[PDB]
Symmetry: D2
Subunit: 234 residues, 4 copies
């Protein structure tokens, strides 16, 4: 029996990873701001996959929300085995057009939210030799016009993840670097065709699930994957 | 229904990938200099996994060998779906002690070998929208003392793979970057325990197999994985 | 005939750059929170180097301060030729011990400060084909234990500077990446000997000055320099 | 009195660096295949700059040529202070079009030539706390279509230089990363206008000279500079 915590679990990649891990029998602890969505997913997975699911409001932009979430998760399940720090968002504007508010929100979720998530479960993961997966972006290590605020936070997250790894060699840290994915990311909605340059979240979640089946001594550090319909840029 | 070519298939990571892909029913075309080893692996997989296996001598340091190998593979199977450019070797010495011969051999296998392999199958992979996996190393993007020769060829290989990808957006190129693996690499023999800082080839091959089950529109570009017992260095 | 704006000009690297550029006859616009320090530096350089110097309070953590500073600079001099976005700070703790306040302050100065600085002067620099120098760090592209907060903001700054450059090909962006420098950085005071692994600010400022003498068509993008007494880590 | 060895000194960047260093009074040891050119430069610099100049045939693709060159240089001057490993060449073709010969030549000059150059003077530089400058390319850390052979060797050279640095912390290694420069590089001839995307070698050599005036305790590790007329790509 293993326990996976997933942030940003209410839709898109996080929801997909929850579903895939449920298929392998993980107990799940789900967090996001959209509690209605979390409840709906949880009931479905409990019944259809026969897993235990816990869910709780989580706003990773707020220190106290992360703290309370983790306290409740740890109370529910004991120690965790997998933490998926996946919540993120993107605003895309030339850097002189990007607002203070937009840049701050991206920093609070994509960077500090990850940091808060990982630190909250860190002692637990150290005990379990667990796996923290952080969904950054393929743009954690390249640049795009209009991406300056988003990209800067994803480079920062990459550095954060690797630094957590250096500081905690008893835990396994996995940077997941998808290209464009057909989600609500970037003010959009699912339903966008693969051909317009998008992965589907269920493909990503399947990449994840199947790597998480590796033995506990394997540390998958980095996975970058994009649609064949996305131009291969570096 | 699908055909995987594997270089350095006589042992270690390449053999393991051959075994894993045979479990998924791939037809195999195996190349290495140790034909005795290839024949032994081939008969086993044909009988035990029910797959078609072709094998042929291949020395990736020799242009003419790679060309002949590829011609014979293509004749046997028609177009290929997967090409695993895995052959490689390492000599570890301070840069002033490394010999001309040692450096040239590493260049010829780790860089020019990969190049010859991918170019020989490039038109085929373009037709099939196939996948070229290259086993570089985690040191394709970091440095180690005593590794200057080895590392420099792996950095070169990374640039090569990425350039192939930019030049051929109709093909999927996957850079596989393992840390230390328990094989014959670096003048050693299998049997070294995980705890000394080694992944096992069958772990690398299962990560590969399961990522190769993703739909054809998914382009896995990079995977870096290491033993938990290997210090996390970047 | 040319005008250089320098943030964090009250001490350390920024003061040194101001002094070096004054030797070359640049008019200077100095910003920092320590106005006492700026006034003292300004009077000296006006008399001893014969240059025009303007100074004004600047807190790069505050949008309104940067906007006011830039408005006053532009009013005083017209368009600027050089903008040195140098203000920065570091708190060094394991990622789980770093405080919310420490992380936010680093974000606000090292990342958002730089952003505000460059955007405030961007239209000016576009007119003059000018040069924006940002003092990041050698750790804008490597990791250190205890530096996760600091490093993550410097990785973010690197991505920011490069994105500014892609978005504004009519401006020259120069990422200056020093190693350890003997300043007040990291809660210290100047006077630490070179042998303990420190460059002196006047060495960094002379590297800058002399690269700033290159013709206007030359775009110096990156300079990384460290003391011989600092271990060469990547 | 200081001694600078320069490979690829017969034209372009290497010649320019010789000229600039002569202006600062360095004794010079020049190597390239074009001995007539070297003699012409040497006579000019001896008379006009009053420096000592030694020159000797050097083909960095040949181990024995490098060895003999270094022996003769060390015999002439004693220990050296600066070694500029600058010889290089580029062929630009899609990777499946690039010939064995072209790729080998690039490897022999851009990679192994550098290695041979640096190892030959390594003991000398260790005694003098000297500076080895290697002219790689801005493409030592990015990719270009048609550049696969060239770029791969420049990534390899970057790794080599940094590895020499890790292995020899008593020597200073400087990676010089120009963009396009108006030389004979790439089968061209000087005279190309700056506006078509080119630096002039004398600008590069001036960047170099002036950084080489820094104290001996300063280790300039990396300098990347391009023309404002070259698109800023990463
Ligand atoms: N899709 C792509 O194209 C693409 C490309 C790429 O390179 C990287 N990525 C990265 O993929 C990861 C998942 O994004 P993705 O699945 O594609 O996006 P979307 O469908 O918008 O779901 C966002 C989820 O995050 C949650 N969430 C948001 N704010 C929160 C908060 N304050 N506190 C807690 N949760 C918060 C939000 O939930 P809610 O709170 O209920 O609104 C929702 O579950 C991110 O790191 C991206 O940067 C994507
Ligand atoms: N193991 C590690 O620690 C570690 C760490 C890391 O980061 C990356 N890697 C990388 O993993 C890849 C597979 O190596 P691995 O499995 O660990 O090594 P080993 O057990 O020695 O098997 C070598 C195979 O290559 C073949 N082969 C050799 N020369 C050949 C030639 N000229 N032509 C054709 N084939 C040639 C050789 O066959 P044979 O020709 O019959 O002698 C044998 O099948 C390499 O790229 C590494 O750089 C490893
Ligand atoms: N020294 C190193 O070891 C090392 C290593 C490395 O790799 C990178 N770096 C980087 O070098 C750059 C200059 O730092 P450095 O000269 O070494 O540090 P220090 O002597 O503390 O002077 C800091 C200056 O910044 C100013 N400043 C601070 N907050 C401000 C604010 N909110 N608004 C406006 N200004 C603000 C502060 O002025 P004041 O406002 O009057 O208190 C002072 O003038 C930074 O980006 C480092 O990250 C350093
Ligand atoms: N110019 C650019 O656009 C650009 C862009 C970039 O990113 C990097 N780079 C890099 O800049 C450095 C100097 O190249 P650059 O000055 O621009 O090129 P060019 O005018 O062709 O002079 C080449 C010199 O090398 C010598 N040489 C050649 N083979 C030799 C051998 N076997 N042994 C010894 N020497 C040999 C040759 O002399 P010779 O032997 O008499 O024919 C000549 O002096 C290289 O590393 C580039 O990769 C350039």
């Amino acid at each position: 029996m293993k326990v996976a915590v997933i942030t940003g679990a209410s839709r898109g990649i996080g929801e997909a990873i929850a579903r895939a891990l449920a298929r392998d029998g993980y107990a799940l602890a789900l967090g996001a701001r959209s509690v209605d969505r979390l409840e709906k997913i949880a009931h479905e997975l409990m019944q259809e996959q026969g897993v235990e699911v816990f869910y709780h409001h989580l706003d990773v932009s707020k220190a106290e929300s992360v703290e309370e979430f983790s306290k409740k998760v740890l109370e529910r399940f004991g120690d965790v085995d997998v933490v998926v720090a996946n919540a993120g968002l993107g605003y895309f504007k030339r850097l002189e057009e990007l607002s203070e508010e937009e840049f701050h929100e991206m920093i609070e979720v994509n960077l500090l939210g990850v940091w808060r998530t990982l630190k909250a479960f860190l002692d637990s993961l150290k005990r379990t030799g667990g796996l923290a997966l952080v969904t950054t972006s393929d743009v954690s290590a390249r640049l795009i016009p209009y991406g300056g605020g988003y990209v800067s936070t994803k480079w920062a997250a990459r550095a954060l993840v690797r630094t957590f790894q250096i500081e905690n060699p008893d835990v396994r840290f996995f940077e997941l670097r998808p290209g464009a994915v057909d989600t609500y990311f970037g003010g959009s909605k699912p339903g966008k065709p693969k051909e317009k340059g998008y992965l589907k979240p269920d493909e990503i979640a399947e990449a994840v699930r199947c790597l998480l089946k590796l033995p506990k001594d394997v540390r998958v550090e980095e996975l970058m994957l994009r649609s064949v319909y996305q131009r291969p840029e570096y």
